[PDB]
Amino acid sequence: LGFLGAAGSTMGAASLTLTVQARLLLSGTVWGIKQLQARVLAIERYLKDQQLLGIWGCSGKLICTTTVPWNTSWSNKSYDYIWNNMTWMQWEREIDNYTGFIYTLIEESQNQQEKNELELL
Amino acid sequence: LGFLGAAGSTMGAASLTLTVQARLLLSGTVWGIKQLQARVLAIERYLKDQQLLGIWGCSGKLICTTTVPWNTSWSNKSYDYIWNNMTWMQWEREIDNYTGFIYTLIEESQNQQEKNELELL
Amino acid sequence: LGFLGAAGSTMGAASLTLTVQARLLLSGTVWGIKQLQARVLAIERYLKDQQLLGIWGCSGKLICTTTVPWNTSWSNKSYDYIWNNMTWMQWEREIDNYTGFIYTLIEESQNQQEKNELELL
Amino acid sequence: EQLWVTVYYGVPVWREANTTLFCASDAEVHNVWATHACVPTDPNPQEVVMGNVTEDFNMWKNNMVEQMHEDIISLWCQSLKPCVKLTPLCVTLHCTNVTTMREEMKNCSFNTTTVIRDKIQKEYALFYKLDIVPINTNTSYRLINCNTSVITQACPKVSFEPIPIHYCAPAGFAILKCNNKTFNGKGPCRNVSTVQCTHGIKPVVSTQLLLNGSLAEEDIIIRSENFTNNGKNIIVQLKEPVKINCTRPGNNTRRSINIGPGRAFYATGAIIGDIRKAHCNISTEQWNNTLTQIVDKLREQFGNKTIIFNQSSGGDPEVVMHTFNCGGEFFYCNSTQLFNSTDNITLPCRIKQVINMWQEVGGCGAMYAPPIRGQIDCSSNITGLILTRDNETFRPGGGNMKDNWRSELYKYKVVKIEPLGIAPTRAKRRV
Amino acid sequence: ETFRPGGGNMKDNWRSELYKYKVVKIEPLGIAPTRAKRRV
Amino acid sequence: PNPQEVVMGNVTEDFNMWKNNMVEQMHEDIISLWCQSLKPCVKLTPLC
Amino acid sequence: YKLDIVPINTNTSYRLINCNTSVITQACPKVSFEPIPIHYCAPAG
Amino acid sequence: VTLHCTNVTTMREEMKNCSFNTTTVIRDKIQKEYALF
Ligand SMILES: *[C@@H]1O[C@H](CO)[C@@H](O[C@@H]2O[C@H](CO)[C@@H](O[C@@H]3O[C@H](CO[C@H]4O[C@H](CO)[C@@H](O)[C@H](O)[C@@H]4O)[C@@H](O)[C@H](O[C@H]4O[C@H](CO)[C@@H](O)[C@H](O)[C@@H]4O[C@H]4O[C@H](CO)[C@@H](O)[C@H](O)[C@@H]4O)[C@@H]3O)[C@H](O)[C@H]2NC(C)=O)[C@H](O)[C@H]1NC(C)=O
Ligand SMILES: *[C@@H]1O[C@H](CO)[C@@H](O[C@@H]2O[C@H](CO)[C@@H](O[C@@H]3O[C@H](CO)[C@@H](O)[C@H](O[C@H]4O[C@H](CO)[C@@H](O)[C@H](O)[C@@H]4O)[C@@H]3O)[C@H](O)[C@H]2NC(C)=O)[C@H](O)[C@H]1NC(C)=O
Ligand SMILES: *[C@@H]1O[C@H](CO)[C@@H](O[C@@H]2O[C@H](CO)[C@@H](O[C@@H]3O[C@H](CO)[C@@H](O)[C@H](O)[C@@H]3O)[C@H](O)[C@H]2NC(C)=O)[C@H](O)[C@H]1NC(C)=O
Ligand SMILES: *[C@@H]1O[C@H](CO)[C@@H](O[C@@H]2O[C@H](CO)[C@@H](O[C@@H]3O[C@H](CO)[C@@H](O)[C@H](O)[C@@H]3O)[C@H](O)[C@H]2NC(C)=O)[C@H](O)[C@H]1NC(C)=O
Ligand SMILES: *[C@@H]1O[C@H](CO)[C@@H](O[C@@H]2O[C@H](CO)[C@@H](O[C@@H]3O[C@H](CO)[C@@H](O)[C@H](O)[C@@H]3O)[C@H](O)[C@H]2NC(C)=O)[C@H](O)[C@H]1NC(C)=O
Ligand SMILES: *[C@@H]1O[C@H](CO)[C@@H](O[C@@H]2O[C@H](CO)[C@@H](O[C@@H]3O[C@H](CO)[C@@H](O)[C@H](O)[C@@H]3O)[C@H](O)[C@H]2NC(C)=O)[C@H](O)[C@H]1NC(C)=O
Ligand SMILES: *[C@@H]1O[C@H](CO)[C@@H](O[C@@H]2O[C@H](CO)[C@@H](O[C@@H]3O[C@H](CO)[C@@H](O)[C@H](O)[C@@H]3O)[C@H](O)[C@H]2NC(C)=O)[C@H](O)[C@H]1NC(C)=O
Ligand SMILES: *[C@@H]1O[C@H](CO)[C@@H](O)[C@H](O)[C@H]1NC(C)=O
Ligand SMILES: *[C@@H]1O[C@H](CO)[C@@H](O)[C@H](O)[C@H]1NC(C)=O
Ligand SMILES: *[C@@H]1O[C@H](CO)[C@@H](O)[C@H](O)[C@H]1NC(C)=O
Ligand SMILES: *[C@@H]1O[C@H](CO)[C@@H](O)[C@H](O)[C@H]1NC(C)=O
Ligand SMILES: *[C@@H]1O[C@H](CO)[C@@H](O)[C@H](O)[C@H]1NC(C)=O
Ligand SMILES: *[C@@H]1O[C@H](CO)[C@@H](O)[C@H](O)[C@H]1NC(C)=O
Ligand SMILES: *[C@@H]1O[C@H](CO)[C@@H](O)[C@H](O)[C@H]1NC(C)=O
Ligand SMILES: *[C@@H]1O[C@H](CO)[C@@H](O)[C@H](O)[C@H]1NC(C)=O
Ligand SMILES: *[C@@H]1O[C@H](CO)[C@@H](O)[C@H](O)[C@H]1NC(C)=O
Ligand SMILES: *[C@@H]1O[C@H](CO)[C@@H](O)[C@H](O)[C@H]1NC(C)=O
Ligand SMILES: *[C@@H]1O[C@H](CO)[C@@H](O)[C@H](O)[C@H]1NC(C)=O
Ligand SMILES: *[C@@H]1O[C@H](CO)[C@@H](O)[C@H](O)[C@H]1NC(C)=O
Ligand SMILES: *[C@@H]1O[C@H](CO)[C@@H](O)[C@H](O)[C@H]1NC(C)=O
Ligand SMILES: *[C@@H]1O[C@H](CO)[C@@H](O)[C@H](O)[C@H]1NC(C)=O
Ligand SMILES: *[C@@H]1O[C@H](CO)[C@@H](O)[C@H](O)[C@H]1NC(C)=O
Ligand SMILES: *[C@@H]1O[C@H](CO)[C@@H](O)[C@H](O)[C@H]1NC(C)=O
Ligand SMILES: *[C@@H]1O[C@H](CO)[C@@H](O)[C@H](O)[C@H]1NC(C)=O
Ligand SMILES: *[C@@H]1O[C@H](CO)[C@@H](O)[C@H](O)[C@H]1NC(C)=O
Ligand SMILES: *[C@@H]1O[C@H](CO)[C@@H](O)[C@H](O)[C@H]1NC(C)=O
Ligand SMILES: *[C@@H]1O[C@H](CO)[C@@H](O)[C@H](O)[C@H]1NC(C)=O
Ligand SMILES: *[C@@H]1O[C@H](CO)[C@@H](O)[C@H](O)[C@H]1NC(C)=O
Ligand SMILES: *[C@@H]1O[C@H](CO)[C@@H](O)[C@H](O)[C@H]1NC(C)=O
Ligand SMILES: *[C@@H]1O[C@H](CO)[C@@H](O)[C@H](O)[C@H]1NC(C)=O
Structure with missing residues (x-):
């Protein structure tokens, strides 16, 4: 438990390590110049990840409710069976080559109910 | 379409380019020093704009619902007629010489219902 | 009134200076190197304080509703009597030697209803 | 089913990413290794114990050594410039036998600069046979490196003892160390662990x-x-x-x-x-x-x-x-x-x-x-x-050079976090 | 003639290649009238 | 641009004059300006 | 000036007062010396 | 330094084969090298 604690723990019931991962993500001469190109990198790394969460209407919640449903092109994985025995490392590898399309799609959908909020009153 | 895409498009129905403007706002020797005073400027440019949205109670929504109504001193512009044929760049020029008052006035109202939230329960 | 305005004013009814404290927190050769180790420090100072607010589920509200109740080990202070005549300087000093526990405990509770939100639907 | 999607942030996912490392003093007027600009604070690192991880370490391909190899050269070479230089001293030395201290010592004369710019006094000092090289019959004796590159004097207050240091990446990066002494790391480690910063390593x-x-x-x-x-x-x-x-x-x-x-x-x-x-x-x-x-x-x-x-x-x-x-x-x-x-x-x-x-x-x-x-x-x-x-x-x-430091960084690797991930659940609570 | x-x-040999370029600053902030008061 | 000089009230704050490091911070600053403003200039030697 | 110069032959062996201690540099003529007022203040936060 | 510098002994036009009286590499014993300019 701690920094990246419970990394090898359960697939879905290991949510207890979400908060400890988020807190330690930013808070934590020859070296001085290196420190300048060591602290700015840590700053934008946190902001870059926070950029995606902010635009999708799911900033600061650790759950990002959306409207776009699943697509057959990703994979076929059952519920409650793939979610108890599978390495989370391999799960990301399966979608990395096709992960980038989701970011644009959600924002296109996120702007829909953003406009309808004023209309629906 | 893209970085500042659809800039010359419709006045109010061009909201589709809102998200693409936000994502690209931050993510994107002699010149090493120049780079240092080229990325920090990029960072604060995002935070300074994000500072206004954060305190007004409209962080990460792309709309800012408020309570302060319009004032006669800004201008007289009709609805659905000025909103289909007018240059947005010219629109800002008209109020830029008086825009600064809005920022302070809104938070004087934003902090109001913040207290009433506890009182109303 | 202004930067740290009304610092010596009332304890609970001095919330009017909350917004002005927030805006000024970030917006505001021999010196050039000094400026580099003067502007990055200002940035993380805002982020570090914003890190605690973000993870506790009270980002950008100025009020952090929680579930963890009081504990007898902090102090016995009455309501509406200690809240009208007391130096806020002295208030923080009392708990500063034990304030560190709150940050972890709140997160351990903030993650509970995060999971129950999906379950409760 | 009408399967929706949601995003989990803060989940453990890895990626190999070359980057920079900090320095920690973990501890005295000067030192060739800085150990003064390094952050001294190491308040009880967690050394969190991971488990059931089949992670692969590459020891030839690891660039922590290469990153460190350039760091060491920078410290030595940058720690010499702000102090005196030998030149002008590598003039031909009217240099003879020793008049008894013996063997390498070759008590030797300079015939060089005074201190008041112009006068030039004929002072003398000892030298070792290895240091001195022949270019007269046996007096044409100068320094071994004046023929190739300028020569600089070690600055007297600068020490040389190898004070231990620690390397570790900034926030947003992790360090993987597998704690079992049976690994010639080119394949899987099983008992992997995370440490906030590297333990003691002495740059000798x-x-x-x-x-x-x-x-x-x-x-x-x-x-x-x-x-x-x-x-x-x-x-x-x-x-x-x-x-x-x-x-x-x-x-x-x-x-x-x-x-x-x-x-x-x-x-x-x-x-x-x-x-x-x-x-x-x-x-x-x-x-x-x-x-x-x-x-x-x-x-x-x-x-x-x-x-x-x-x-x-x-x-x-x-x-x-x-x-x-x-x-x-x-x-x-x-x-x-x-x-x-x-x-x-x-x-x-x-x-x-x-x-x-x-x-x-x-x-x-x-x-x-x-x-x-x-x-x-x-x-x-x-x-x-x-x-x-x-x-x-x-x-x-x-x-x-990249041999004397491979014996201590075999069990270390810089890894990048990928906190973004997508999961299917029920959704459409919003409009 | x-x-x-x-x-x-010196500011002549490079004017012929940057005539069609201009550094510009974004102004993402703006105010629009709508219907509001959904909050308290 | 027109500093506010906001006035605090009823504050019992202690200031330490010997222990304050603004002077010590500025003392090194002044030395840096003087010493760093001479390197990009001609040196007298050789003249002595 | 007599103060600048220091004795080391009889009375002509006169060098600078600091050549035997540390190197001597000349301030560039363009660099002014008037004490222009300055202000010190910490960053935001 | 002032160059004991003469005509060309053929290379011609702007070539003015010339001598230096250099400073040598042993920080002493100036040697009289030459090169073109
Ligand atoms: C593997 O690791 C070992 C263990 O560290 C290491 O051996 C150690 O080597 C270092 C030098 O590299 C030794 O430290 C030096 O030791 C002597 C003597 O000090 C001892 O004795 C005095 C007696 O009063 C005690 O007070 C003292 O505590 C020690 O027991 C000295 O030569 C050194 O002191 C000088 O250097 C210091 C560090 O730079 C300075 O702070 C100090 O002021 C001294 O310098 C000044 O004084 C000098 C006096 O002559 C003067 O000449 C200088 O110009 C200057 O003004 C230093 O303490 C250490 O004892 C060794 N340890 C053991 C257990 O033997 C190995 O070297 C290492 N292996 C490799 C390959 O590096
Ligand atoms: C390396 O070689 C050099 C060159 O030879 C050598 O330097 C010599 O050192 C000796 C040290 O004694 C110097 O001799 C001294 O010079 C004067 C003469 O007026 C006096 O100070 C000394 O006389 C006293 O001491 C003598 C004993 O040393 C007595 O016999 C005498 O009665 C006096 O009490 C003494 O003669 C000599 O001048 C220098 N020479 C030069 C050229 O600098 C150096 O010693 C050698 N180093 C080593 C490590 O071998
Ligand atoms: C971080 O970046 C460094 C380089 O900046 C990476 O190391 C270098 O990786 C490249 C390939 O990406 C190697 O190039 C190849 O090397 C040989 C040269 O003979 C040959 O196979 C190819 O022609 C090609 O040039 C390079 O050798 C290698 N090493 C160096 C010193 O540059 C490193 O992989 C990166 N680290 C990560 C991602 O962890
Ligand atoms: C430092 O270099 C100078 C260079 O001038 C050396 O001066 C030389 O000193 C020697 C004696 O040590 C002289 O030799 C003698 O000179 C005269 C004739 O010139 C005569 O007494 C003898 O026949 C003998 O040759 C020499 O002239 C003199 N000059 C030169 C150019 O060599 C000096 O000795 C050197 N000092 C050291 C410590 O190396
Ligand atoms: C600066 O001077 C040194 C010392 O003279 C130069 O060293 C030179 O090294 C070469 C190669 O070893 C020598 O050539 C031959 O080497 C062996 C061993 O002696 C043998 O085949 C011959 O007897 C011969 O020495 C050479 O003699 C030696 N000296 C010179 C003057 O060339 C070094 O190369 C010089 N560096 C530069 C940048 O000029
Ligand atoms: C996988 O690596 C972890 C982390 O190194 C290993 O846990 C370590 O286990 C050892 C042996 O039991 C513990 O040492 C003990 O610690 C205390 C004194 O500090 C005391 O109980 C004993 O005298 C002994 O020294 C060590 O503390 C512990 N490390 C941590 C961070 O908890 C684990 O054993 C490894 N697993 C395998 C299967 O090799
Ligand atoms: C480098 O500079 C030296 C400075 O000493 C030059 O040495 C000079 O060489 C010339 C001959 O090339 C000498 O001239 C002859 O000297 C004697 C009388 O002193 C006598 O043989 C003749 O009547 C004639 O004057 C000269 O003395 C000598 N010294 C000086 C001070 O000029 C050397 O030539 C220069 N080298 C080059 C390549 O420029
Ligand atoms: C999946 O994505 C493709 C490519 O954009 C699209 O044509 C299709 O309609 C989507 N839905 C399904 C169920 O495949
Ligand atoms: C979806 O994957 C499952 C995995 O069990 C498989 O049974 C099914 O045939 C797949 N469907 C298609 C259309 O490939
Ligand atoms: C996970 O466990 C279930 C239940 O025993 C089993 O049916 C399934 O094959 C397992 N999956 C894997 C990938 O081992
Ligand atoms: C790359 O994308 C392909 C589909 O184009 C996929 O099969 C593969 O798993 C992805 N990842 C790789 C090759 O690492
Ligand atoms: C507009 O602003 C002015 C200046 O603060 C104020 O007096 C007035 O009441 C506001 N409202 C209208 C309708 O003018
Ligand atoms: C407001 O502007 C409109 C523009 O059509 C004009 O008709 C109207 O008279 C203006 N009102 C005042 C009070 O100036
Ligand atoms: C915009 O179009 C409307 C409708 O035709 C017209 O009445 C109005 O004058 C136009 N406005 C401008 C500024 O051209
Ligand atoms: C500047 O402010 C004036 C009134 O002070 C206004 O008439 C004008 O439109 C504003 N903008 C300009 C001149 O661009
Ligand atoms: C207060 O904290 C202590 C220490 O964790 C705990 O044992 C106790 O139950 C808490 N509650 C009270 C009322 O003391
Ligand atoms: C709590 O403090 C109050 C202060 O008025 C005191 O009356 C009360 O006895 C204290 N309780 C305990 C259990 O110490
Ligand atoms: C605050 O005022 C109340 C009401 O007069 C009084 O009872 C109490 O003692 C006061 N507290 C302090 C700390 O002076
Ligand atoms: C420090 O902690 C102690 C108890 O550990 C407490 O009594 C005290 O009020 C705290 N604050 C101080 C001394 O400023
Ligand atoms: C994986 O290792 C963990 C400890 O990291 C252990 O609790 C779990 O039982 C292991 N699972 C298997 C299938 O061996
Ligand atoms: C003197 O120097 C020569 C030449 O280096 C050496 O061979 C000899 O051993 C030396 N003699 C003495 C007595 O030191
Ligand atoms: C070395 O000799 C010097 C001569 O002054 C003496 O002071 C020093 O103590 C000696 N060093 C020892 C005995 O270690
Ligand atoms: C080391 O000593 C041996 C004899 O013990 C000798 O043959 C050899 O040449 C020596 N090596 C060096 C580098 O001096
Ligand atoms: C090694 O053994 C010899 C035997 O004569 C002894 O004198 C010496 O002290 C020993 N070396 C040590 C203990 O370092
Ligand atoms: C080397 O020195 C150490 C430390 O004093 C000593 O314990 C050891 O016996 C020595 N080595 C030998 C071979 O005597
Ligand atoms: C090791 O090198 C030898 C010689 O080149 C080669 O034949 C052999 O295949 C190599 N071994 C492996 C495991 O690649
Ligand atoms: C640790 O090393 C031991 C000793 O060789 C070995 O038996 C064991 O399998 C290893 N355990 C791991 C890598 O988890
Ligand atoms: C040498 O190794 C031993 C092993 O017990 C250790 O106690 C000692 O401190 C080590 N010496 C140094 C100088 O690190
Ligand atoms: C080492 O190799 C040399 C040839 O390079 C040979 O003459 C000599 O006998 C060898 N020595 C040993 C101890 O094997
Ligand atoms: C606090 O200061 C205000 C003015 O800022 C003053 O009216 C009030 O009396 C002061 N309170 C005390 C207790 O001195």
């Missing part, structure tokens, strides 16, 4: 012998990708550290020359002790103790007394003789007895002031330490050992 |  410089290294758990490990590799060769981790002692009880005085305005060049004064060359003291049975261990393990990788230890052919002084560094000196020990396949045996050692160790690696002025006024009596451990493959015969080798 | 070669000033 030597060749064929790694000193003050890690503490072995009564195990001998040999790590090389291909045991029949034609390039780099065996690297050995030794038994429990062996106490090796070297000393030069040749107490000397310190002389000031004032080579220029506000310069104060220094050189060896004289000898007032006893003419006794530098020597190293290793126990007589320790070398056989470690011998039987590597020998028995060598019978597995290599065909099974057919083991022969022979000296290197030669060609580079930095490789032929073992290199030492204690008390600010730089010994050059004839390593014949160490690798001859063999009380308290004595190992001869010579001393040369000028070293160009940091001129052929990154490029800048050669360094030379000033004499030390006091005794050394430096004692040290030994935990590493290097050999080369030509019955199989092993010879001393190395040469490449 | 007679023409002669000239120049001299």
